[PDB]
Ligand binder design. Sequence first.
Ligand SMILES: C[As](C)(=O)[O-]
Ligand SMILES: C[As](C)(=O)[O-]
Ligand SMILES: [Zn+2]
Ligand SMILES: [Zn+2]
Ligand SMILES: [Zn+2]
Ligand SMILES: [Zn+2]
Lengths: 314, 315
Amino acid sequence: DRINTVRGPITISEAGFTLTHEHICGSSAGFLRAWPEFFGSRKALAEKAVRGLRRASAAGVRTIVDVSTFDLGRDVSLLAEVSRAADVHIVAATGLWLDPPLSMRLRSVEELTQFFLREIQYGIEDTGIRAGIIKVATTGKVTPFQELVLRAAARASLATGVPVTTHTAASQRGGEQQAAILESEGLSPSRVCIGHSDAADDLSYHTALAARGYLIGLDSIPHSAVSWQTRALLIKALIDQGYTKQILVSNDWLFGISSYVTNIMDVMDSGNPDGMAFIPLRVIPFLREKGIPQETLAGITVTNPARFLSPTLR
Amino acid sequence: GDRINTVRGPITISEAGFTLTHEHICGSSAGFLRAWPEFFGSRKALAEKAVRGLRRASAAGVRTIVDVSTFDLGRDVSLLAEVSRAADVHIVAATGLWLDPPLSMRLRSVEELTQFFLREIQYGIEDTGIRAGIIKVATTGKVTPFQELVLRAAARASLATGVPVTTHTAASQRGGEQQAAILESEGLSPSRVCIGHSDAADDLSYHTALAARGYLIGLDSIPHSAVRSWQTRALLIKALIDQGYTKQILVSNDWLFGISSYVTNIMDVMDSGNPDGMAFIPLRVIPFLREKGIPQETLAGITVTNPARFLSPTL
Ligand SMILES: C[As](C)(=O)[O-]
Ligand SMILES: C[As](C)(=O)[O-]
Ligand SMILES: [Zn+2]
Ligand SMILES: [Zn+2]
Ligand SMILES: [Zn+2]
Ligand SMILES: [Zn+2]
C-alpha cells in the first residue's frame, strides 16, 4: 500500500520516522507568489527550509506531513522543491484552516467535497501532486461553515481512505465536537488525528479520545519553549494508560510565517533553534531517560504515522 | 503620464480610446482560479467566454477595460494577458485590496502595505512582469481601522508613482466623504481619485459636492439594476453633465465573466438580466443619453478624454 508525497507515491516502509504536523510556510492563498519579498525572497525561504529539513534529516527524520491547506498559503511547488533538495519525503494536505476566503466560505458541503476529492484524486492546482491527508480547523465551538468542512472531509476520507487531521483549541476540548460530527458521517476514529492536543493538560480528554480509537496529536511541543518538558510528559502519561498506539508527535514548526505579526518567526527561532529537529534531538532523549523503551518510541514515531497515513477504507 | 501600464505592456495615452474604468474578468479569491478551475467549468471555458465578451464590447466601440480586481478578488494577471491578446482589447490591471483580505494582509502595517502596492506598480505582479496601472481600495461603513491603513498605503503608492486610486463604497451612506477625508489627509489630489459605485444612490447633492472638489465620480454599475431601474441610474450621468461636471464623470458596467465570491450560479442570474455584458454601456446607456439630448462631444469626453486624464500617471 502506498502514500502520496510531493515526489509521487511511496511505500509504507519508506516513510520511516515521520513528523505528522509541520509546515514549510504558514501564509495565505496566493501570498507567496504575490509578495515573496515578505520572506526576503522565495529563494531565501526555500534555502532556509532545505537547511532546516536537512538538519532534521541529520537527526533521523525521514518524512514530514505538511498540513498547510489552500487558505494557509500552501504552495505545493515550493514543497516539491524543498523535499527534493532536502531529500526528505513531504506529504501534502487538502482541507481548510481558519482563514477561508469568500470563494470557499460560500460553498456547499457537496462543493467542498468535490474540491477535497480533486486535490486527493487528481492533483493540486496543475501540478499533478496529490494530497495524502485532509486538514480541518475549528474554533472551540464549531461554526456552521466549519461543520460543512468537517462533513466534506469525512466524505472525502470515506471515498479515498486518506486520513483527517484537525486543529483544535484543546483548552476548549474542541476535539469532542469535531469527533461527534465526523462520526455522524460514518468516519472511523482510526482515520482521524485530533490535533493540538498537547495544549490541554486534562488527561481525561486525551485518554477518552484515545480509547475511542482517535489518534492524539501531541504536535506543538516546542511552542512552549518560546515548559516543554511538561508537554512531553503527556506522551508518557498516555503510554502509561495503555494508549501507545494512539500517539502522534510533532513540532508544528514552520520556516516562514506571514499569517501573524511581522517578525514572529525570529522570536520562534530564538526559542527553538532546533526547529523540526526538536522532536528527535530533545523530546526522544527526554522520554528515554524517563524509562520509555526505545521500541515504544520507534512505535510512536514510525509505526503510528504509517498506520495513520496508509489509505484505509475502514 | 505619457504611457499607461497594461497587461500587454505600456501603451500611449491616445491608444486607450473608449475606456470602461471599472470592470472584472473574474470575481474570485486569491489562489482560487489556480486551485479549482472547474468551479468555472474550466480555465479554458472562462477564458473563451471572456474573449467573446471583450470582442463584443470592442465591436461596440470599447478599446480598453480597467480590471479593478485586486489580489483578494483573485486577480490572475496571466488570465488577463491571455484574454487581452486573444480579444485584442487593452486591459489595465490593478493593485490594492478589496473586502476580503486574508490574514497575511490584514496583519500588515501601513508601511508594509505601501511596499506591496509599490511592488505591483513598479516591479510587477507575481513573476509576470505585468505592472498595475491603478490602485483599488474598498471600504465599508465609516471606514474600519484596517481599511484606513489600505487607503493611506494607496495614497502613498499613488503619490510615489502617479497611478490613480479608485474606490468601492456605499453611496447610500455617502461613504465617499470618509474616503476623501483620509486621502486628502495624505496629500493626495482629488483629481487622482475615483469615488466608485456612486450610481447606487440617487443622492445628487453627494455627487456634486465631491465633483466640485475635483473627485471623479464612478457611475460604474449601471446594469446591476437590470439584474431602482437602470434608466434612473443613467440619469445621474445627465444630472452631473447639466451641472457642468462632465469632466468628473467615469462610466462603466462593473461586469464579470466568472464569479466565485458569491453564491453558486449568480453569474447565470446576472447574465440573464444583462445579456449585453460589458457592451451594456455602449449599446444601451450611450444611446439613452443621446436620446435625452446629450451631444457626441460630451459623450466622447466622458468615455475617452476623462479616462485618459485619470489613468495617465500624473504628479
Ligand atoms: C498554522 As497552526 C499555528 O494552526 O498549526
Ligand atoms: C467586485 As464588486 C460587486 O465590489 O464591483
Ligand atoms: Zn493549527
Ligand atoms: Zn499547524
Ligand atoms: Zn466594488
Ligand atoms: Zn467591481
